[PDB]
Each structure stands twice: as structure tokens, then as C-alpha cells.
């Protein structure tokens, strides 16, 4: 179990730790979050009580260093930082725990939700999508645009998701135009899995990371990426059977975690209806289709 201490909480903010959230009042004696499960990436995220504009946060893995949060009154936000002095850190954390100034990561024993949402997400891949090499953790916010969005403007602050474009020379083999557009297996299996991602685990990891940025930060380009990666699989006639089974599990937990009030903006009607009811894989996503039909029958 690891800890992310806070120097202080000078501004009233709503703090999220993965799917959990709690409110901290202005100058409330809050010094961080303890009992964070080891073995998973995590995301700490914030919304100022004053300006709900700009939900922002940090992806991290406690195995990679000792991290803390400190408010910067100049830049006006809670910043993640690494403490290199491990004895200063343990000493800091021990004092805050002794004074019980920390919230406990509130995981139910039965509950595999976070594992299931982050199964294939790796910090090393997050850091290649979010490029800030000097830090071990990655900042994301609501407003950050993707490389592909930038092609249709500060490159330093972009989400470098893998570009997917169904009407592109990468996607369409000369002389296989109709074949490759109507059945995207070539593009999925050769171009993307074999060529770019190397394996389906890396593909699923980017798909899961995109959903989580889309859900927690309302990041529109992330939602576009998540739906494109779903649609590329569903529009492929030839997909390894283990991939379809895993995709069904992935999407199931995403839809179940998806709060109902954010569904209208986070779910693309066309992709989902095509995927569940028209695509090659219309009969391959039993768990996802069941939860979609019982939780969001209006979208369909």
C-alpha cells in the first residue's frame, strides 16, 4: 500500500482518486491519500470549486517513485511532484498518518473495477502518449487535443494517440479498396496489431487509457480515439477469438462504470448501434450488448 501526501489544501477542490471522489474545503487540514493499491496505474484528478472549467489530473504508478501534491498559487493548480529524498518522504508520510490527516483509498475487497478498467494500461505507454520525459507521472486535462485533432496547436501539450483513419492510404491497400473499406481486418491485424501496436495488449491499453481520459476529464479527442478503436475491431471480419472475448469484458466494465448522466455526451450513437447490431461482430459482444440494452436503451 502506497501514499500520495499533500503539502496542504489551500483552495476548495473536488479530488478524484480513480473512480472515487471526495470534497476538500478551502484550507481544510488535508494531507493526502493512503492505502493506494500497488500493482496498478492510478489517476489523481481535481476540479476547483470555483472554476469547474478544466478537470485535470496526473497518471502515476507508485512503484516508479515517491510522489506528492502541492498547490502552486502562481499557476493556480495542484501539482504532482517527485520527492527524491526517500527518508524525508517516509518521515513526512509517517507524521501525516500518525495525525490521521489522510483519506484511505476506499476499495471494497470484492471489487475488481479498477483492475478491470486498467488491465492493459502501462505507465510506460502513457508516457509515450503524454510526452513530458522529465517527470515519471503524466498530466492530462479536459482541453488537451490529440495529434489527429491537430491535423484537422502546441505539440508539447498534445495526446499522441495512434492515428486511426478509415479513409486513408494506411487503411486501404491499392487495388483492395472496396474489400479493405468494408472489412477492416487488414488494417486491424497487419497495419495496427502486427505493425504499430505489436500485440493486442498494447492496443487494449491505449483503448482503456483513452476511455478513462474521456470519462474522468471529458476529453473529447480521447472519446474519439476510444470509439475509433472499438469500431476498428467491430468492422473487422477476422479478429482473434481471444481478442473479441477480452474486448467484450473491457467494454462491459467501461459501460458499467460510465455514470448515466455523462452517457449522452460520452457515447457515440452511430458507433454503438453499428457495433452491436450491424457489424461483423454484432453477435460477439454478449456482455456489452446486455448491459448497454439494460442501461442505455435510448441511445439504441
Amino acid at each position: 500500500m502506497n501514499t500520495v501526501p499533500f503539502t496542504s489544501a489551500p483552495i476548495e477542490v473536488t479530488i478524484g482518486i480513480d473512480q472515487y471522489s471526495f470534497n476538500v474545503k478551502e484550507n481544510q487540514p488535508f494531507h493526502g491519500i493512503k492505502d493506494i493499491p500497488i500493482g496498478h496505474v492510478h489517476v489523481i484528478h481535481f476540479q476547483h470549486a470555483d472554476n469547474s472549467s478544466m478537470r485535470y489530473g496526473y497518471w502515476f504508478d507508485c512503484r516508479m517513485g515517491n510522489f506528492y501534491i502541492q498547490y502552486d498559487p502562481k499557476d493556480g493548480l495542484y501539482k504532482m511532484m517527485e520527492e527524491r529524498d526517500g527518508a524525508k518522504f517516509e518521515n513526512i508520510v509517517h507524521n501525516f498518518k500518525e495525525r490521521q490527516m489522510m483519506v484511505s483509498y476506499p476499495k471494497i475487497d470484492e471489487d475488481d473495477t479498477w483492475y478491470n478498467l486498467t488491465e492493459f494500461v502501462q505507465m510506460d505507454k502513457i508516457r509515450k502518449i503524454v510526452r513530458k520525459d522529465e517527470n515519471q507521472f503524466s498530466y492530462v486535462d479536459s482541453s488537451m487535443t490529440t495529434v489527429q485533432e491537430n491535423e484537422l496547436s502546441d505539440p508539447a501539450h498534445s495526446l499522441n494517440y495512434t492515428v486511426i483513419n478509415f479513409k486513408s492510404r494506411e487503411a486501404i491497400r491499392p487495388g483492395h479498396e472496396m474489400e479493405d473499406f468494408l472489412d477492416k481486418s487488414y488494417y486491424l491485424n497487419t497495419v495496427m496489431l502486427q505493425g504499430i501496436f505489436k500485440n493486442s495488449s498494447n492496443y487494449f491499453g491505449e483503448l482503456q487509457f483513452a476511455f478513462l481520459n474521456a470519462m474522468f476529464f471529458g476529453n473529447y479527442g480521447s472519446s474519439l480515439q476510444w470509439h475509433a478503436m472499438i469500431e476498428l475491431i467491430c468492422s473487422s471480419a477476422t479478429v482473434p477469438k481471444h481478442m473479441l472475448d477480452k474486448l467484450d469484458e473491457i467494454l462491459y466494465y467501461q459501460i458499467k462504470t460510465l455514470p448515466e448522466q455523462y452517457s449522452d455526451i460520452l457515447l457515440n450513437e452511430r458507433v454503438w448501434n453499428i457495433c452491436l447490431y450491424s457489424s461483423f461482430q454484432k453477435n460477439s459482444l454478449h456482455n456489452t450488448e446486455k448491459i448497454m440494452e439494460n442501461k442505455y436503451p435510448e441511445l439504441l
Binding site: 479513409k167 486513408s168 492510404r169 486501404i172 479498396e177 472496396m178 473499406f181
Partner: protein
Amino acid sequence: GAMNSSNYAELFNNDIKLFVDDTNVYRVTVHKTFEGNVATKAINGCIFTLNPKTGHLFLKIIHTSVWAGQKRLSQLAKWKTAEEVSALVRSLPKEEQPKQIIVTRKAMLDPLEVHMLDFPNIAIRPTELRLPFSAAMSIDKLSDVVMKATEPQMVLFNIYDDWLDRISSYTAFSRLTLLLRALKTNEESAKMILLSDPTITIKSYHLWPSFTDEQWITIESQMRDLILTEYGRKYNV
């Protein structure tokens, strides 16, 4: 974006463009089988690719052999159209290639776009105009070369004959669409109008009769009558 009444004179500017109509590519007769089921039999078709400024028509004849052994022919027809238009463009010298292609049916947009990915600077556009190019097969000489073809073939026509010597391309296109709209609404009466007078002939190298300027005004008036009529006969007005 979409071509409509608002941007209609764009058709006659000096940016090369082509209309593509696919409505006669896949043509069938439906008939009963000996067992009393229904079956289709394909007949020859054609892609109607037209430069509205110059009148140049690239008639790509679609022979029935192209459908042998194929499934989902209506879908294939759009992709075959797009394959043939892309081949046409690649065959033209760079300075003759179009700067836009306007498809008369929106279902041709994605097939054409995918086949033209090599030409990112050629704009593929739909239109809101209800153009009557389906009636091209009511032009006897075009119908004749399509039905006689024994293999795939491209035939080049000027659908305006020599009209551009005397009228603008705006006026010529307006005459063409009036003639074709008439042939589409009532083919027999339209053809009677055009041929009734034995003394007006069709030159060997032309598609329509050699009307004087005055006779075209009479003809054009008779076609409007026809269309407005049938529009009553149809809706009872």
C-alpha cells in the same frame, strides 16, 4: 460542400469538373423462374461521366460479364463505378484532370473518396439538384452502343452536339436537363416531340436533331408543356 441552386453557376466556370451518375451501371430485368420464383437477369449498363462546361461525355460501358459470380451487386456497382472513374482520371493528362467530381447520389461519396485517395486535391462533392441523368439511356444512340457492347468499352461523346457554337454552356446545360427531364417523365411524348418533323434530321456525328434557333425555342416550349402536363396528369391539377 454540396452543390445546389445557390452555387449553380459554378458549373460553368473554368475549373474542370465532372458529374458522375451511377444510376444505369447495374441494370436488371426481373422475371419468373420455371418454379415460380423470381430472378433477375442483368443487362449492359453504363457510367455517365459528364463535363458540364464542355459537354464532353465519357460513357463507360458496363458489360454484364463484370457481375458474373459476384454477390451484393448493388453495392458492388457503386465501387465498380468509383474504380472506373478513378481509372479515367489517372488516364487523363494532369492538366485535364478535374478539380472536383460531383456525384449525383450520396451513396457514391465514400466509394469514390476511397478510390481517389491518391488525389487529395480533387474534391468529391454531392449535390442537392435532382438531375435527370438516369434518362441518358433514352437517347437512342447512347442506348444503342450500350446494348450492342460485347466487352467493356469507353465511348466519348459531346452531349451538346454543336450547340456551344451558338449558346453558352449555362444555356446548353439548361437545354440538356430540360430534354432529359422530359424524356424521364414521359419518354414516348418526348421522343415524339423531337422527331415528329421528318425534315429535321440527326447528323451522323450528333445525338439530337439539327434544330434552328427558332425550332429549339419551339421544342423547348413543347418540353416544358409536357413536363407541367404530366405533373398534372400525375398529381391531378
